[PDB]
Amino acid sequence: MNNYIFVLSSLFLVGCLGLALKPSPIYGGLGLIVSGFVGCLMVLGFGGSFLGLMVFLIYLGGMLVVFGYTTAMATEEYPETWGSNWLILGFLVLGVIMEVFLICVLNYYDEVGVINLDGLGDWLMYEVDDVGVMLEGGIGVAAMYSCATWMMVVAGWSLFAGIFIIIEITRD
Amino acid sequence: TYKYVNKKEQESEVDMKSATDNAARILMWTELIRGLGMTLSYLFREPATINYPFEKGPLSPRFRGEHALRRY
Amino acid sequence: MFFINILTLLVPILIAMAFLTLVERKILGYMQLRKGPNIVGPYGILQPFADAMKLFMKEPMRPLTTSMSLFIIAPTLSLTLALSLWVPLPMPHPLINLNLGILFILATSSLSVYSILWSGWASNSKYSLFGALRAVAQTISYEVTMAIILLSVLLMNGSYSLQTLITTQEHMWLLLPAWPMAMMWFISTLAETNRAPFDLTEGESELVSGFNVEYAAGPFALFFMAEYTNIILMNALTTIIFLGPLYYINLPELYSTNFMMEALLLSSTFLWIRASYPRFRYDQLMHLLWKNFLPLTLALCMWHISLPIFTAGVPPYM
Amino acid sequence: MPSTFFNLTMAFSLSLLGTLMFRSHLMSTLLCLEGMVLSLFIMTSVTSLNSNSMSSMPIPITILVFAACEAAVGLALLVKVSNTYGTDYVQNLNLLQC
Amino acid sequence: AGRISAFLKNAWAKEPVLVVSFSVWGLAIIMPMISPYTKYASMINKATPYNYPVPVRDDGNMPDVPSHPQDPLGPSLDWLKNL
Amino acid sequence: MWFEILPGLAIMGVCLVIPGVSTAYIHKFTNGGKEKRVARVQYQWYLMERDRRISGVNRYYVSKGLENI
Amino acid sequence: MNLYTVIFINILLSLTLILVAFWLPQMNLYSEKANPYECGFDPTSSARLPFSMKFFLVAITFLLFDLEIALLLPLPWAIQTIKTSTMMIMAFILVTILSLGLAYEWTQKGLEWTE
Amino acid sequence: SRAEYVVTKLDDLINWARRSSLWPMTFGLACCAVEMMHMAAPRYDMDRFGVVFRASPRQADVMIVAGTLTNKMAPALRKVYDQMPEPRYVVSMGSCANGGGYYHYSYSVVRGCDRIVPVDIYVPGCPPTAEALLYGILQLQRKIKREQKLKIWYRR
């Protein structure tokens, strides 16, 4: 349980390695769901909750749409998978070797600075109001309705304008 | 002689009494509730099933079935 | 003692799921003027177990054109998420107590759409791809309104905790101050669970069987167990949210018994609905949800934002 | 925290490599631009939680808000690229050399 | 003023979803303005004590700050008990 | 007739009550005859941890009252 | 830890039923059994060819509305603020521009599927 | 022996599950398929025997050939039969399917569906009455009941 966060961030890393090799967008959309889920679990481990579930919710609807677009516009006869091509399969395997090397190396020349394998877990939560009541990330995110109302104006306008933007882009 | 199945355009005027009826039909799904009622009534009818092979469907003396050679 | 507590959740649910298949076939029967199963066991009670055993002795299919990794993953995901939706449900005390249970239900439900998508896409067949692209269309239809409806109801509740709905409904069902959202909520759950008149991903009439046309045997059994578990859960969730069962801190057995009666009754209405209506066209499902429900849901969201403000009825945070 | 940022930051680099190293589909390059948004969102979320800065937690949400718009605008353009050549291959978008 | 009634009756007959949607949208913006309870929403939220009420040093020029919480001074929630 | 649906509807009913009843009792059986303590906020979690430390058996649900001072 | 346990237990059951389904039945594989299904005749083309999406504009409008859910979900915490007037005004405007955006798309035949 | 006895009762167990869940493929050819719809109708309610029509050959156990098999349709009937997972059974229903029937001498008709697929049960009639088909369906369950796969595996 002391390696818990380290493993989640290691899984997150691979999900973006697989994503970077860019197989068929059917599988690229599968990596984003698993990285989205892994990343959701990290924000939960560090004490978040609302921020964890939102990024998971939002990326679940994004890949639903992306799936619909893949089957219509980004599909070929023989979709590529991570094992489909020997060269990509090489860099996915090799990519995992490198991290096992970079972590081991960089851990050797500093021991604490970057990667402190000797002390995984000791430094996850720094402080925490033990007798607190109002500490959920939802309260911080909810400040957009009172304190950082400017955040919401630009966010709302961004989405409002976007409807006009896409309707014109796609127009016949 | 002929009749119209789907002609009714002897247009009337939408009274406030009648408009509120159209809206309740649309918002309250009234005709869809009537259909739910018809299948509920059938739930409490006796099924038409017969207990085959212990019960048999009726047949008449003319029934054309398997062949046979008769004698005197 | 926690493992024993999983047993008394995942096993009763799975048994209750199976008999829902029997209740479905007999209620549909008598509504159609026939008897449904009644030979395999006393009144068919063994019919569910026969179908299960037969399906797991049926040869499983590995089509030559299929993408096997996702072909297998998809049914496994389907049944996992169906069982996982249950662990937060308070009845009246949940197995797993989550602060944001409602989001866990929303997020788990969405992720289960990918079992339809991946299976259909992985089958590499035209009818299974038609079924998958209806799952995409069906989700785009009901997702936006379903979340906002929950938001409206939870502004009378105060939080995303499911266990706090028990306390909100201590003196009254939320069905009364919220029957417009319950009406829209109920129709969403029929769309969420691919139930008639919204069985568009399967839709035997138009698509031979939709997304699971290439599935036979035990892998196809897992998809169904998932479909019928979700029916109970979505109606169980609707019973907690809108039809709050009686809760006395001294009689937790009362809440469960009342909770079950209303969950069974709502589950029946799914079977009642399937026997009564024709199937929607999946383009018309979008128009129903975007041109009727969504305009009403936004107005009710704005109604229920203001409503606690001008009655000084803000729910407590805890 | 130290080990997490290193892994998160390298995750962002891998997606920047993915974005900068095109293959055929334009859709695949769009998914790498979402790998980057996800890495940045998780870094910001962990930073704000670790430092207990609640007033910064609006910011990770705006990143998602302004990242969707790109995904929408990116997908809208991908429709116009497909309506012209019937695929989304980048090698087709080369008329402008002359 | 005369044609509108014809239109509204027309929409109400054939488009009640939108007529209900506009009414509820517009009724939600009026009700806070006219309700005689909208003012308490802030007050009740301000009367909920999450943080510890850190006491202040009594210099000697504090004639309207209670010494003991059961003093007859200070903010009172009687309006909330009898609300 | 229609009441022949009940034998299956009654099984399904018994099955759906075992989850709620079994969880409520298991919680009492693993928490000293009391409801499983809920901790929504950090303050409540602190109370449980303090109760666990002063119990003397490293269990938060073994309450100590005025007997103990 | 409980929430991790209960989900592995769920996964192991789904796995366990998957293994039994494949290694219990008696399997007889031949080419004509494992071909794709298409109502009794051979497929005329692979199923991986492009499949036109007639509702694509609604698909990307789902994304924009999906993120506007992410802005309304903090409301249950937001109605706990002292600045009730501000919270409410920002909420009304947000929902109103989502509605105004929806009305524009509706009137532009944006909700209609492309023929 | 004890094991040979246990194998026998395990054989009855698996048979019983296949007897009690026969899922015919939604598939009829001509007028004989009308009487197959009557067997599904309320009076006979084949559903009460555990008989459920499933559209996809992957999900179907039984193929009932209910009508004339022409040469043009012969390859397609075989293909959906091949795609049925095993175990799988064919009920040939009607004179047309049984042996050509009224069209035996036609240039365009297959003189019996059993030239194309293996047939388990033949149901005579033009058409067989819904009870006749029902008797044939219930005669297929007794055929499955006599199945002895597990016992024969033991004696191999």
Ligand SMILES: CCCCCCCCCCCCO[C@@H]1O[C@H](CO)[C@@H](O[C@H]2O[C@H](CO)[C@@H](O)[C@H](O)[C@H]2O)[C@H](O)[C@H]1O
């Ligand atoms: C997707 C793939 C995911 C796989 C990710 C890798 C999982 C394994 C985690 C490796 C990280 C380091 O994992 C483990 O960390 C501990 C402390 O945290 C290191 O350190 C441990 O041993 C050292 C001595 O060497 C002691 O100080 C002490 O017992 C402990 O700190 C271990 O030497 C290392 O084995």
Ligand SMILES: CCCCCCCCCCCCO[C@@H]1O[C@H](CO)[C@@H](O[C@H]2O[C@H](CO)[C@@H](O)[C@H](O)[C@H]2O)[C@H](O)[C@H]1O
């Ligand atoms: C032409 C294009 C632009 C037009 C559209 C934009 C118009 C501006 C609308 C957004 C208004 C934000 O309005 C601004 O809100 C913030 C907080 O929210 C207030 O700022 C306040 O912040 C916090 C509140 O807790 C206090 O600590 C601070 O001292 C105080 O100034 C400003 O006094 C107000 O001006």
Ligand SMILES: CCCCCCCCCCCCO[C@@H]1O[C@H](CO)[C@@H](O[C@H]2O[C@H](CO)[C@@H](O)[C@H](O)[C@H]2O)[C@H](O)[C@H]1O
């Ligand atoms: C070194 C281990 C660390 C991990 C390494 C992987 C990091 C992520 C890199 C993602 C980019 C992959 O980089 C890749 O470059 C190759 C050339 O080499 C290009 O790819 C192009 O040429 C190659 C070589 O014939 C073809 O196989 C490929 O189909 C074609 O698109 C693309 O531009 C990009 O897909």
Ligand SMILES: CCCCCCCCCCCCO[C@@H]1O[C@H](CO)[C@@H](O[C@H]2O[C@H](CO)[C@@H](O)[C@H](O)[C@H]2O)[C@H](O)[C@H]1O
């Ligand atoms: C471009 C999109 C625009 C469309 C949307 C427009 C929405 C406009 C909404 C205006 C409604 C604001 O309504 C306003 O509510 C606030 C607080 O809620 C009330 O304010 C009252 O209550 C608050 C606390 O609740 C007290 O602290 C305050 O002293 C008192 O005046 C106002 O009396 C009322 O006028």
Ligand SMILES: C/C=C(/C)[C@H](O)[C@H](C)/C=C(C)/C=C/C/C(C)=C/Cc1[nH]c(OC)c(OC)c(=O)c1C
């Ligand atoms: C949905 C599930 C069920 C259990 C239903 O109750 C019934 C039992 C299935 C039906 C209706 C059809 C079963 C097989 C089939 C494909 C028949 C061919 C057919 N079908 C016709 O119409 C439907 C005809 O119409 C004139 C025909 O001529 C012919 C030849």
Ligand code: SF4
């Ligand atoms: S046997 Fe007679 S009833 Fe049956 S399909 Fe042939 S002609 Fe029609």
